[PDB]
Ligand binder design. Structure first.
Ligand SMILES: [Cu+]
Lengths: 127, 126
């Protein structure tokens, strides 16, 4: 559908759609108006990424210049965590009840099969 | 915002969409209803502020090759802003989308090499 809402790896993008079925039939991007049941759908644009491990961690935004990299520190901030896996169909959804308004960051980590890791951030807010 | 944008290579123009008569929410490439809509543009790269920028929003013909002929683009056109420099880096346009359907925003930048680059943002109404 749309091509505007995204997280980026260079030229390769992952399109994101957000909806909140308990509140509305509308679709959102980085300004999510309500607390509650939230579904985030990911559509990987580059077919080659379907064979690449992809991890998602959504954290409360600590508003620090540098994001924590330690797993214990990241865990303290974590709203939701999906371990790395290959998405062969190129698409997936996550559902979460956001009980609290605030700023959040979705951290998408790709593992190149050079074994190198790249992380991209999509920043959004709830409420 | 940080997620909603049209791309020129690695460069971005961030886009926010509102419908003030309907809701206090902000949208991106899915506009929920027909009617009064405001699209706000924020040009991230300072060098792009000195570049002529043209905007044409068309109904999406859903074909692999987009018409380039002026009559054909005009037949599909919802709104057209002639090329202009946005020195402040931001601007908004207001339009009443009367019809549900798929749309394409054609953004044309004129490099100071004088060559033109177009990017497309795709969205839908309803
Ligand atoms: Cu982008």
């Amino acid at each position: 559908m749309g091509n505007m809402c995204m997280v980026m790896f260079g030229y390769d993008m992952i399109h994101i759609t957000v909806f909140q079925p308990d509140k509305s039939r509308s679709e959102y991007c980085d300004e999510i108006p309500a607390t509650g049941r939230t579904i985030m759908a990911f559509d990987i644009e580059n077919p080659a990424f379907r064979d690449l491990p992809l991890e998602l961690r959504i954290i409360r935004d600590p508003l620090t210049p540098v994001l924590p990299t330690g797993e214990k520190e990241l865990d303290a901030l974590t709203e939701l965590h999906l371990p790395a896996k290959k998405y062969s169909k190129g698409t997936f959804s996550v559902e979460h009840n956001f009980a609290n308004n605030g700023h959040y960051i979705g951290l998408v980590t790709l593992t190149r099969e050079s074994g190198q890791q790249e992380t991209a951030q999509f920043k959004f807010m709830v409420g």
